[PDB]
Amino acid sequence: LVRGCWTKSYPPKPCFVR
Protein backbone atom coordinates (compact mmCIF):
# COMPACT_ATOMS: atom_id res chain seq x y z
CA LEU A 1 0.00 0.00 0.00
CA VAL A 2 1.29 3.42 -0.93
CA ARG A 3 1.49 5.74 2.05
CA GLY A 4 4.07 8.07 3.48
CA CYS A 5 6.20 6.51 6.14
CA TRP A 6 9.85 6.38 6.98
CA THR A 7 12.00 4.06 9.06
CA LYS A 8 14.23 5.49 11.73
CA SER A 9 17.04 2.98 11.92
CA TYR A 10 20.51 2.53 10.53
CA PRO A 11 20.71 2.69 7.69
CA PRO A 12 17.77 5.17 7.81
CA LYS A 13 15.31 4.59 4.98
CA PRO A 14 11.83 5.84 3.87
CA CYS A 15 9.35 2.97 3.96
CA PHE A 16 8.41 0.61 1.22
CA VAL A 17 5.12 0.70 -0.72
CA ARG A 18 4.10 -2.63 0.74
UniProtKB/Swiss-Prot annotation:
Q: Which cysteines are joined by disulfide bonds?
A: 5-15
**Cellular compartments annotated:** Secreted
* Tissue-wise expression: Expressed by the skin glands.
As recorded in UniProt, coiled-coil segments are none
Q: Please report which protein family the annotation says this sequence is part of.
A: Belongs to the frog skin active peptide (FSAP) family. Brevinin subfamily.
This molecule's function is given as: Mast cell degranulating peptide. Antiproliferative activity against human breast and ovarian tumor cell lines in vitro. Inhibits granulopoiesis in rat in vitro. Causes histamine release from rat peritoneal mast cells in vitro. Has antibacterial activity against Gram-positive bacteria B.megaterium Bm11, S.lentus and M.luteus, and antifungal activity against C.tropicalis, C.guiller-mondii and P.nicotianae spores. Has hemolytic activity. The mature peptide inserts into the hydrophobic core of the bacterial cell membrane and increases permeability without disrupting membrane integrity.
Protein name, per record: Peptide leucine arginine
